Write a protein that binds this DNA or RNA. Structure first.
Lengths: 88, 65, 99, 149, 213, 22, 82
RNA sequence: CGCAAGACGGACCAGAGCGAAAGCAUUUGCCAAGAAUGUUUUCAUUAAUCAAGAACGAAAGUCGGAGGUUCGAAGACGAUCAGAUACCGUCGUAGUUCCGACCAUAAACGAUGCCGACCGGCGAUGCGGCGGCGUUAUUCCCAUGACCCGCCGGGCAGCUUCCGGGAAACCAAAGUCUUUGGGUUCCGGGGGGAGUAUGGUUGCAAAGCUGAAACUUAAAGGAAUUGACGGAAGGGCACCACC
RNA sequence: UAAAGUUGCUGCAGUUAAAAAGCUCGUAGUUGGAUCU
């Protein structure tokens, strides 16, 4: 955002995950719940935050899959949205 | 190779009996359900039987997939 | 005559399955009929791993992997030896090779 | 199976063997009749009346306490609707589907379902006309249906 | 038995069964072995009603006794867990043993070297002894089998419900069958315990004999 | 001959005949 | 198998069956006298009630309709009849 | 580093779900539906299948309107080849996209009409309901979620079986068939000619529906078996193979 | 004419040999649960 005295002063512009991490996190017997919010901080900085989560297999689970029903996914996504909006 | 001499020699070899029977001992564990089965058979008052406790959980199926 | 009870696909209980493009030839193949491989391979070969790890500015950087999804059509999957012909009895077998 | 669906569902009420008023039920036949009359005056159909008699008053089956069915009771007292409950609900559903279809004209599934509902309406109307519940001149129309609702 | 108190099950027999794990079946249940199971445990194991086990053992002993040529009964075991038990049963009772692999065509191929025409067939496990059982369906051969909860009952005429997986249980069941057959025959009495004991019929791992030598 | 190409030939013949009989 | 006595089913097997496939069909539902500590009278509630029942002597919810059996509010004593 | 446009919704995504079929996959909201389960609610035979008739119906195609990123019939070149009017490559029109009106055809397939009953077993899975040790979250109690173990009802399927059937392949239906009759619709009668000619009808067209005959022919064809062959795969051998 | 159960009402076929309409709705037609000495 500025340069003084052979010195570049950077500001936060965005955040991301490396492709390897996101590729590893997507397995084939669970659901991926994805949410996003356009939210402005208290100083005019309007961000877009993306949250991703995956359903968890229990430690005593025998069923191969760990799928959440559509209403459960919607509740999880609404919780994601509200928590991210609160925290931002 | 099979001759009668080998058969008799092997039946001599298998003519082995332990001092104490491996079957009957002082205390044998028995689960509550088999204890009820025995009490149905009127053999539930045997004192050789030790009522052990059943498995804590219900994890006996291997995970599928 | 019928070679396979499932017709070489997994289209049970629906009428249409969306198609995908073969990674090799770009042929249109139904997503349930295409042969799917998920290859998770180290981004550097087992030969270049020594030089790359020696030249790393970090200690125990652990190289990232590469997660590629390949969707072969039947012709390309047979040519690439990803799957091969089986005897009439052994065709029914559905357990993946042990590898 | 279902008339207009491929389903072969089995769920339904399983009546008990006994045809007698239950021991817990102290309500007399006239008391049940009065409760039915009040519920009908409140504007409830025989299905709803039976539901709330079973659910709050312990009346397992009104026929086994009164000796008469709820619709027959309402007809005898004289406060039964002009057209039967099932036909009225079918006509209401058809009216709702038609009102949806006017603002959503690309909904071919709605058109298919409306055709099915109107076939059911016509079958029920033909049955009630043979049984003389409906006048022989009664016909279902695409314009006067909302008036009957 | 037939409610004959001389044939009723004894406390010592119950203790032998419980010590050998005879009452303990598997985690799977063949639908034709439902009538022999008392109840499933908290860990998925099926418990075998030992009263029905004794009833079927006595029925099998009665069937064996009603063959006045003892060599016309064939006792078969393909698994090692029951080979010594089968040999001991054949020695004590006079039956003909087939311990080891059963050659197909033994009952059907008249020309073969091991061709025989038994009058009754007893096997340790219908799953592991499926080959003689099938041949039993070719020569009018009645069949007795020691059946676990998941045992298949095809071509099995008298199914004895017992644990046939453990060496202790297999040996004890064969020993008890030999004891019952002898008692019905007349040799050895029903009053004092048999001078032979189940551990003779058991199977010992080669490491066990190495430990014992 | 492939049946669909025989059908195509027949349809082209029918079009040529339609041009014949206007 | 091949000898099942269809005239005298065991009560456990008959209770295991669907309510319509029993020898003589019987419902799985029941009626309960339910009583609240804040009430001076009992009421009769269907086990599978489809409406929200209220206390006869109060204004409190008694049971909430669900997919199957209704959810009786805690603190209310319920006893089956017959 | 941005901006614009149009297209499409990866991975999750499954022999999983929903829909009459065609078909349906970013979030959120609205709208009207729907199956299944639950039901000691209501009506009380109101039902099954159906000439006529009607709704929907992939893709391509046809009219107008908008758009027009990619891909791309036709087409223009460049290659390869004996020749290539193809396969391969660079471009590229219609089209592919949306709106309205047509078209009503697909290997529109489960190549298997719908409704009903009976006839083996097993383990899974989806939805609903019921019951129950125990673990985990909502800081702790019940409820409820996620698991675990069963049961019931419909559903997509799978394995197994000397149920039975079948020419067999195979099918728990394609079984309950010379021991032949539960109800009903459609439809076939050796192969070609030929789904052609012709008439009728529908369509703006392309074509759709209905649809022969003369003539010709001893076989076409189904399933399976043994060989031979393969510019199919996998093994094995040999200095008349190689290293 | 029989053979021809190759016209099948008795009495045929329609997964692959010829063949179930792409799919539902629907009138006529055909068929229609228990029950009354």
């Amino acid at each position: 955002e500025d340069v003084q005295g052979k010195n570049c002063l950077t500001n936060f512009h965005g955040m991301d995950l490396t492709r390897d991490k996101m590729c590893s996190m997507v397995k084939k017997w669970q659901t991926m719940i994805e949410a996003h919010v356009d939210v402005k901080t208290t100083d005019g900085y309007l961000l877009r935050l993306f949250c991703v989560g995956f359903t968890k297999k229990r430690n005593n689970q025998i069923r191969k899959t760990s799928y959440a029903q559509h209403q459960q996914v919607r509740q999880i996504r609404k919780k994601m949205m509200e928590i991210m909006t609160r925290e931002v | 190779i099979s001759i009668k001499l080998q058969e008799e020699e092997r039946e001599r070899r298998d003519n082995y009996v332990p001092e104490v029977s491996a079957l009957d001992q002082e205390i044998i564990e028995v689960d509550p359900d088999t204890k009820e089965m025995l009490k149905l058979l009127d053999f539930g008052s045997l004192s050789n039987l030790q009522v052990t406790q059943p498995t804590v959980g219900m994890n006996f199926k291997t995970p599928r997939g | 005559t019928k070679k396979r009870r499932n017709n070489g696909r997994a289209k049970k209980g629906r009428g249409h399955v969306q198609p995908i493009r073969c990674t090799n030839c770009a042929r249109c193949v139904p997503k349930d009929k295409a042969i799917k491989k998920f290859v998770i391979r180290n981004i550097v070969e087992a030969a270049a791993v020594r030089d790359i790890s020696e030249a790393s500015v970090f200690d125990a950087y652990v190289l990232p992997k590469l997660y590629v999804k390949l969707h072969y059509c039947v012709s390309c999957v047979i040519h690439s030896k990803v799957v091969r012909n089986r005897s009439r009895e052994a065709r029914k077998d559905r357990t993946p090779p042990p590898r | 199976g279902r008339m207009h669906a491929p389903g072969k569902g089995l769920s339904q009420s399983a009546l008990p063997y006994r045809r007698s008023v239950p021991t817990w039920l102290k309500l007399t036949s006239d008391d049940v009749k009065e409760q039915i009359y009040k519920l009908a005056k409140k504007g409830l159909t025989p299905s709803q009346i039976g539901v709330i008699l079973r659910d709050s008053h312990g009346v397992a089956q009104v026929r086994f306490v009164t000796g008469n069915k709820i619709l027959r009771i309402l007809k005898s007292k004289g406060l039964a609707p002009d057209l039967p409950e099932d036909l009225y609900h079918l006509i209401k559903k058809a009216v709702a589907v038609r009102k949806h279809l006017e603002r959503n004209r690309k909904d071919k599934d709605a058109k298919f379902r409306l055709i099915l509902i109107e076939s059911r309406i016509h079958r029920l109307a033909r049955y009630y006309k043979t049984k003389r519940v409906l006048p022989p001149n009664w016909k279902y129309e695409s314009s006067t249906a909302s008036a009957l609702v | 038995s037939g409610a004959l108190d001389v044939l009723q099950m004894k406390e010592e027999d119950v203790l032998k069964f419980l010590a050998a794990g005879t009452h303990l079946g598997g985690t799977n249940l063949d639908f034709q072995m439902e009538q022999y199971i008392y109840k499933r445990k908290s860990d998925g194991i099926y418990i075998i009603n030992l009263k029905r086990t004794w009833e079927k053992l006595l029925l099998a002993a009665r069937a064996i006794v009603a063959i006045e040529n003892p060599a016309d009964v064939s006792v078969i075991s393909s698994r090692n867990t029951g080979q010594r038990a089968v040999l001991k049963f054949a020695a004590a009772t006079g039956a003909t043993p087939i311990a080891g692999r059963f050659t197909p065509g033994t009952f059907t191929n008249q020309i073969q070297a091991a061709f025989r025409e038994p009058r009754l067939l007893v096997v340790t496990d219908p799953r592991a002894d499926h080959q003689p059982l099938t041949e039993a369906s070719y020569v009018n051969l009645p069949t007795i089998a020691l059946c676990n909860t998941d045992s298949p009952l095809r071509y099995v005429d008298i199914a004895i419900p017992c644990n046939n997986k453990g060496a202790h249980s297999v040996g004890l069941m064969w020993w008890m069958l030999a004891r019952e057959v002898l008692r019905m025959r007349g040799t050895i009495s029903r009053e004092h315990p048999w001078e032979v004991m189940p551990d003779l019929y058991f199977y010992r791992d080669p490491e066990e004999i190495e430990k014992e030598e | 001959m492939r049946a669909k190409w025989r059908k195509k030939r027949m349809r082209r013949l029918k079009r040529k005949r339609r041009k014949m009989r206007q | 198998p091949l000898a099942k006595d269809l005239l005298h089913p065991s009560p456990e097997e008959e209770k295991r069956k669907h309510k319509k496939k029993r020898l003589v069909q019987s419902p799985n539902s029941y009626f309960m006298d339910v009583k609240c500590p804040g009430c001076y009278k009992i009421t009769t509630v269907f086990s599978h009630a489809q409406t929200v029942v209220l206390c006869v002597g109060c204004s409190t919810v008694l049971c909430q309709p669900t997919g199957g059996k209704a959810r009786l509010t805690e603190g209310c004593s319920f006893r089956r009849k017959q």
